[PDB]
Write a protein that binds this DNA or RNA. Structure first.
Length: 59
DNA sequence: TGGAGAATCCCGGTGCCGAGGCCGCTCAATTGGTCGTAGCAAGCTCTAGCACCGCTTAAACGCACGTACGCGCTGTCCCCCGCGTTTTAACCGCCAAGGGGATTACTCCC
């Protein structure tokens, strides 16, 4: 759904269940409302956006 | 006695799902030796269980006889059954949820 249609603004996503898996490359912005103590997991989360096929500069 | 018709049975056909057998493996039953002890055995004590006698009188029995009560009979009526109608909720299927219990991560404390 999120990848299909640009009317959806925001994607709420838990850090561990949601950080690991598939591309989310029609986002452009990643907000850590809270940041994991293990920096790898925040890196995985950031790179669900910052990825091959990423549309725009990730902030 | 007959009959009609409903209700119960039987015969063969269909299919589905669970019973009966196969497979892999664990872990619980078996083999071997140890060691403690309890309960099997021999022995003594004296409890209390069984037997008998004799007496007392309360408890058991056989009988008379009255009447209280068990039982078959009669009448009624009411209320529970057999059957058609109306309706509701039990059953089935499919999706949701939540919860809880085991696991995994990450930090602080020792």
């Amino acid at each position: 759904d999120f990848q299909t249609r640009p009317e959806i603004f925001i994607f709420l996503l838990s850090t561990r269940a949601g950080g690991l898996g598939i591309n989310l490359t029609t986002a452009d912005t990643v907000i850590f409302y809270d940041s994991d103590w293990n920096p790898t997991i925040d890196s995985q989360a950031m790179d669900r956006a910052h990825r091959l096929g990423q549309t725009k500069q990730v902030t």
